[PDB]
Design a protein around this ligand. Structure first.
Ligand SMILES: NC(=O)c1ccc[n+]([C@@H]2O[C@H](COP(=O)([O-])OP(=O)(O)OC[C@H]3O[C@@H](n4cnc5c(N)ncnc54)[C@H](OP(=O)(O)O)[C@@H]3O)[C@@H](O)[C@H]2O)c1
Ligand SMILES: NC(=O)c1ccc[n+]([C@@H]2O[C@H](COP(=O)([O-])OP(=O)(O)OC[C@H]3O[C@@H](n4cnc5c(N)ncnc54)[C@H](OP(=O)(O)O)[C@@H]3O)[C@@H](O)[C@H]2O)c1
Lengths: 654, 654
């Protein structure tokens, strides 16, 4: 079977991250059988040595000599650490010289939580390990590839990273979905800069049979979260619903859960109907051996609940769940978790056209044959069948304005605008809301005092009339939104624009250059912070603000933007669609059920941009219409199952 | 080099259409070296024998025995002929038994004209050869594949067939682009039915170095058309412009071109400014050795011009260009055609990220490795780099209503509605136009008298008031539009809905069945006639009707549509986007510059469909808004280069 591999990749040096197990282990193994010298990078030393030994043995059986020189290892390499990536490259270069193939395979599962329960640092950690690491390794190895006249960058993405012009929601996995989408987008936008010497593609496999999924594996962990998230979401919504029709504070309502007894809560006449009906449901649909049928929650679900309530603005002591009786193990039975795990597996098998999952060997084989193709760049290869998940087309240009009825509902509204560098857009938008649609007030949340002064001057008349308020956020956007809430009231429309413009630096260096001016690894992390994390932070906080309609706005491209700006802006556009689409679906699972959509100021081609002042004014009017379409209120009566998903997770191009 | 191929496809029977040359010749050759028994199908016998001999010789050099049994030929096989496809299968089955791989490689260039100059039969011929032939061959070979428990259908599509959720315009190649898009869509929708036994994918190569493109090849033919279409479009527009400001009939204006002398026309004081400025330009920008600088046209361009004028409704004798002096050869010089051909080549090389074209061997190699992958279905593999052409995202759901100003311009308008089976949609739309937007009249163009009576009854009040007229088109839609023009005046909005519903037959048969109830090869041709050719015919005619705004409406899917209806409707949706996007770009090249866009009543998932009467009414209101958005007039002042392309070739999902 290995005879088709002999000489396929002979004379090539390949670097494989996550090379000690899974798909990466198989890629490294098959590249070695193909004639390549491979460097396998991962954290655990033993796992790497075991894999190195297995490959070296196979290579000897096949007929290779000096097998120790063909398979090297780089232990203690966590891809989320920049210093560890710099050490990887130095170790690889000293061992084999110039790297031909950079296989960006490592990809952590991530936080595995809904955005509202996702810590910001946990989201940053996923981006560092799965996305930023890919640029960092390319930045270090592409100068040597360009100098020798050839190279290959392969990013191992996923079916759940979506596609060109379509986003795929991945509920509970937004950080992961964004990182996968960014790996594909990197191949798409850097292709033109890296060519003709370097090829850059992505692989997007569908679900793969192996340790990651089988194990507690991804399926078993997803099963436990389904049951944990079900208990959390049901408690959260019922407490929010009770708060609307009850005189007691959230503190007093949460106190009713302290005996942590499902039966006692159901039988409590002093408890609101919403909480009593909830207790009825827990005992009625639960496993009697599971303590989750007799107890409302454990300290872990209690901590997730408290954090949601605190983020939502409810005043509760941090020690409210300190004396909470801990339920005896198991909270969820083996029977419950296994039933849920098999339902996850069956659902995936039913979606696959071939009704079978590939093995890691199957994916790696297809990838290794694909790597021999020298005439393709900027593409996403699908080595295995994808699912039947919802695809959200991104980039619709033909749209109108919402109905006059929806527009009339903006009269007396509270509008929040977030931004700084887009001064024209912010001034035009605040004026349309106050002058055309009779909004009561606009709260202009800027980054700096210089930004606050620029806006107060541009909007002087509305400032003096008390119609426009300014807040300086700095790097504390959540606390600034909390200041906006206490001081001016909860918002209706929320327009989130980036505080920073895109950088204007080269994306590749000249063949004989040191690449010293090229976008650094730190600058790429900064692009992600300002153009991705910025919106994630706002969306995470605004998702618990009842009645909000959030518009996530991407950077602006013009007829005079540099080619590098076009690349980075299109990289952002695509990566953010994954986030917008995922949180769009997650919103339906919460009691607030806010609207979240994306308005794109970025286009693919320079030719499509306005060229004269009339065309510029048309573009600026389209921006107002696009923002109004996603921020006008969708009446409760109209928010049906059908119309609800139409008004969430969409992206429109100005 | 062939050692990596040994045993890769051993024990497989492959059928390759267009197997005597190009990419197909290389696929057959490489499949044979891989261990497969190959049947090569094409028209010319000599070309097939030459290829068969070359492969058999290589096979012997590599070490194979009984080489004559491994490579067979099927001459006189034109894929556009159904009878010839039935003979192909019988010949292949008798030679090697069950076919494992059906390689649908044959793909004719097509008509190579703008839609307005594209004969309807020429468009049908491309669909028969490039698309219908693919279903026909699958219909004959898939029962044997399913019975043996394995099979593979590979459709050779193109980069110019677009992608999932994105259309790519291919000006002058609409028939070809549609056929390519349909080959990809076939893989996408049949995957779930054909699995788990049969795999179905498409390959979408970008431009390929070879005889097709080099030759007179595709580049040289495209160069000659650029110069021919330039002379035709410039003459056509100038004659249309002159007709607006001149007292003379089109007949009398065309008479000024009869001396066929560029100099005499420029120097003619009796000729309108538009024609005199045009003559100035021909002499000024022309090659002096080319008779196109001294003569206005030849009989070929004169025939294309006359046909446009006749289709546009101008009264001219068929013999107007009978006595036209024929210009001496060359009409366009070698220097002119070569300059244009190299500009086509340079433009393609500049768009390719790798700045190089693959060879036929490169594409075929990548394809043959791809064919070994057993764990992927419903995908489009890109074996070579694509261009940087405009991508039109298709399926935007978030849209509003046009401005009240644009809406107010519908007062007193002439509306044409084309349809029959969508009775609810036609009645609702005609009522909105007449009752809500004060349109003067609606002309309801149906297929049959039974359809006319159904509509006259549903719209009885508007019929009696003289506000709703009915026309019975039959299979003569162009003549019916001409009857509408003479009798009721030229239209503003034109809503083109299919006359026929989608069939409700199985798409695959049971493993042990005869497949006798499965959608036949004739029924698939009929689907294409009613759901693709129907809109093409209307769009081809309406493109010359000044002031028209055309909406192409796809079939309807509901929460109760069969799974087969969902597949065929999604097949249509995607295939039509290619047409809409192409004609969208072509419209800018004409003097009429009408709007053409697509409104989709088809969705990908059943779950997205309305489930109750309230959700159904919301869906029906969205249909009205979507149609209004594409049929409200775009004022001349607003039709800028920027805003013009935004309002053409788009597709929105209801
Ligand atoms: N499995 C699927 O169904 C599937 C489908 C589509 C896409 N993918 C993608 O395919 C890639 C590989 O997936 P897989 O299934 O092979 O995953 P896996 O089994 O989890 O991969 C584990 C490998 O990655 C290493 N690794 C884990 N965390 C690391 C870190 N922080 N830094 C460096 N190495 C690390 C592991 O060793 P250490 O723990 O010692 O570091 C081991 O070598 C990922 O990019 C994933 O997103 C997977
Ligand atoms: N070339 C490119 O740049 C490119 C790029 C993307 C996609 N494609 C696609 O790739 C496929 C093959 O293209 P190619 O470049 O190899 O084309 P090609 O050189 O024109 O292919 C010619 C081959 O097809 C046969 N053929 C032509 N018309 C036929 C008909 N009516 N019935 C049966 N066989 C017929 C020819 O033999 P006879 O004349 O004897 O019949 C010969 O075997 C097509 O589907 C094309 O759309 C090509």
């Amino acid at each position: 079977w290995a005879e088709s591999l002999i000489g396929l990749h002979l004379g090539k040096v390949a670097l494989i991250t996550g090379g000690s197990a899974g798909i990466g282990g198989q890629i490294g193994r098959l590249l070695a059988l193909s004639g390549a010298r491979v460097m396998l990078a991962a954290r655990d030393r033993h796992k790497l040595e075991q894999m190195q030994a297995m490959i070296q043995s196979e290579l000897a059986e096949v007929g290779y000599t000096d097998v120790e020189d063909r398979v090297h290892i780089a232990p203690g390499c966590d891809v989320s650490s920049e210093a560890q990536l710099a050490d990887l490259v130095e170790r690889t270069l000293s061992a084999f010289g110039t790297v031909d193939y950079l296989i960006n395979n490592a990809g952590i599962a991530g936080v595995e939580e809904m955005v509202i329960d996702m810590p910001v640092e946990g989201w940053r950690h996923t981006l560092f390990a799965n996305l930023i690491s890919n640029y960092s390794l390319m930045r270090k190895l592409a100068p040597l590839m360009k100098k020798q006249g050839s190279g290959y960058i392969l990013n191992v993405s996923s079916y759940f990273g979506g596609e060109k012009d379509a986003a795929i929601p991945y509920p509970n996995r937004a950080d992961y979905a964004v990182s996968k989408a960014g790996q594909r987008a990197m191949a798409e936008v850097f292709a033109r800069f890296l060519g003709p010497e370097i090829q850059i593609n992505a692989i997007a496999p569908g679900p793969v049979e192996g340790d990651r999924l089988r194990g507690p594996g991804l399926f078993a962990r997803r099963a436990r979260l389904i049951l944990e998230n079900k208990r959390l979401n049901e408690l959260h919504a019922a407490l929010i619903a009770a708060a609307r029709t009850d005189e007691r504070s959230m503190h007093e309502l949460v106190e009713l859960l302290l005996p942590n007894d499902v039966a006692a809560l159901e039988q409590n006449p002093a408890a609101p109907t919403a909480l009593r009906e909830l207790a009825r449901r827990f005992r009625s649909e639960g496993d009697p051996a599971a303590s989750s049928s007799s107890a409302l929650l454990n300290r872990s679900i209690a901590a997730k609940l408290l954090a949601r309530l605190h983020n939502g603005g409810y005043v509760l002591p941090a020690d409210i769940f300190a004396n909470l009786p801990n339920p005896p193990d198991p909270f969820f039975t083996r029977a419950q978790i296994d039933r849920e795990a098999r339902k996850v597996r069956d659902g995936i098998m039913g979606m696959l056209y071939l009704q079978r999952m590939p093995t890691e060997f199957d994916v790696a084989m297809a990838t290794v044959y694909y790597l021999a193709d020298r005439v393709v760049s900027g593409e996403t290869f699908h080595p295995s069948g994808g699912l039947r998940y919802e695809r959200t087309p991104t980039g619709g240009e033909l749209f109108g304005l919402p109905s006059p009825e929806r527009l009339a509902e903006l009269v007396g509204s509270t509008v929040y605008l977030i931004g700084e560098h887009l001064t024209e857009h912010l001034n035009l938008l605040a004026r349309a809301y106050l002058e055309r649609y009779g909004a009561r007030q606009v709260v202009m949340i800027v980054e700096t005092e210089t930004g606050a002064e620029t806006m107060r001057r541009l909007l002087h008349d509305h400032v003096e009339a008390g119609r426009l308020m300014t807040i300086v956020a700095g790097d504390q956007i959540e606390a600034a939104i909390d200041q906006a809430i206490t001081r001016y009231g909860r918002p209706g429309p929320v327009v989130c624009t980036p505080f920073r413009p895109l950088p204007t630096v080269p994306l590749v260096g000249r063949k004989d250059s040191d690449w010293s001016t090229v976008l650094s690894e730190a600058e790429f992390a900064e692009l992600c912070e300002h153009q991705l994390t910025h919106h994630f932070r706002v969306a995470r906080w605004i998702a618990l603000s009842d009645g909000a309609r959030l518009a996530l706005v991407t950077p602006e491209t013009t007829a005079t933007s540099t080619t590098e700006q076009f690349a980075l802006a299109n990289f952002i556009k695509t990566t953010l669609h994954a986030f917008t689409a995922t949180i769009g679906v997650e919103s339906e699972r919460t009691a607030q059920r806010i609207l979240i959509n994306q308005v794109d100021l970025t286009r693919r081609a320079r030719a499509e941009e306005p060229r004269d002042p009339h065309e510029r004014q048309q573009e600026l009017e389209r921006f107002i219409e696009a923002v109004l379409l996603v921020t006008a209120p969708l009446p409760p009566e109209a928010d049906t199952r059908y119309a609800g998903r139409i008004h969430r997770g969409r992206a429109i191009t100005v």
